[PDB]
Structures are given as C-alpha cells and as structure tokens.
Amino acid sequence: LAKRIIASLDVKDGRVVKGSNFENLRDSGDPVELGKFYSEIGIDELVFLDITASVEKRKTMLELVEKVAEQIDIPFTVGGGIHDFETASELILRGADKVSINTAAVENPSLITQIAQTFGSQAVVVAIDAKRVDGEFMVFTYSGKKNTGILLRDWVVEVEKRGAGEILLTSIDRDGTKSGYDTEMIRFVRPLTTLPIIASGGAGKMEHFLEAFLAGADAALAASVFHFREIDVRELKEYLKKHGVNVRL
DSSP states (O other): OEEEEEEEEEETTTEEEEEOOOSSSSSSOHHHHHHHHHHTOOOOOOEEEEEOOOHHHHHHHHHHHHHHHHOOOOOOESSSOOOOOHHHHHHHHOOSSSEEEEEEHHHTHHHHHHHHOOOOOOEEEEEEEEEEETTEEEETTTTTTTEEEEEEHHHHHHHTTTTOEEEEEEEETTTTSSSSSOOHHHHHHGGOOOSSSEEOOOOSSSHHHHHHHHHHHHHEEEEEHHHHTOOHHHHHHHHHHHTTOOOOO
C-alpha cells in the first residue's frame, strides 16, 4: 500500500504563519518558495490552509494558487473557508488539484457531490476535525469552535456516500502537541471507509509516521516538524522504507 508524506502550510495574507527555519531560502516565510523547496526535497503533496481576514481572503487564495501552480509540479490542495461550488471551482481552475472543505460540507453535504460532479471525487478532500467528547468521537466545525453533535462514525460514512475522494482526518486531541498521531482515531475510521485517509495532527518524530501508517492512514500530514526542521523529509522516507512502509523514494 503506497503511502504519502504531505506538508501542510498555514497561510495568512500570503505569508507562512510562523515561517520556517530554512536559511537557504530568499524568504523563508514565502509559501510558494517554501512549497517549491519541499517538492524538491521529497514531499509528495502540499496542503495550503488559509486563514486570511475575510475581505481579501478570496483574492488572496486565488493568487496563492496561481503562484503555486507556476512553480510546483506535485499535487496540492487548498482549503480554508471554501463555502460553495463557485469558490471551489475558481480555485481548482486557477491551478489547485484538490480543495479541502469542512464546515461548509457539514452544513451542506450536497456541496461534496456538487464539486465532485464537475471535478471528480478525487478533487474533493473533506477535512474532518474530531475530538473525544464524553467518550465519543465528535465532529467539530469552525476551526474547532463548534461541536456539531455529529458522530465521527456517521459523518465518515456520509462523506463517502456523498462522493468525496479523500478524508483529511485531524485529531483536535493531538493537533500541535508533537505527542504522536491519534492512532486510536485513525483505527476507528479505517474500517468505516474505502477512501484514502490523510492523518493529521500530533506529528513529533519519525516513529509517529510509522505508527500512523500501521493504523491505516494512507498519507501523513505535518506542518511544524518540517518547517522547524525537526524531521528531515528524506531521512523520514528512508526510515519508513527501512521498516516496511511503501513510500516513494
């Protein structure tokens, strides 16, 4: 089973939030240059998550996609506040391979199908943010602010039924902690769907990626371990290949 290593870049007003530690770059806070670097050193795909204001957001994301497409050959996903078909369509047409939708998909699950009918299921990444609440995995929207009362188990099944192509599964319980991927959550979701699962949140060291792939993740997404150079992408891939993980070398 082929596995993917994906870098996540949080972006705002066209800048990498909290930048990176790559002194070899002209602008270590330029997401286009940083993304290009990652593609040259072995990252398999990129994910850009935009948290721009709201007034310049739409134009800022379309500019990002245009500049990224000029410079990067590997697939990339854009997400963050994509609320309808026309917004998703413009971003894909401007150059993005995939869009990530979360809040708007929960509030209008037909949006999944709408984008998929024009761009294919493979262009639709449904980002699911989940957290343990009173012993159940619950789905959260609005960057973790709202417990929807929807069970992770039910939403995963519905997401596939609606025609999504991939699930970007973020554990709120682990995101940012460097303590490891939420392998219990990944293993909970794995038998419920045939879709590729991108594991997200908690990456701290190379062994965490092995654990995530054993749990059934098809891809492992991380941000700070890469930006702050705590894990080298090539060393990570050689480590994973050494222990039987089918990564692309």
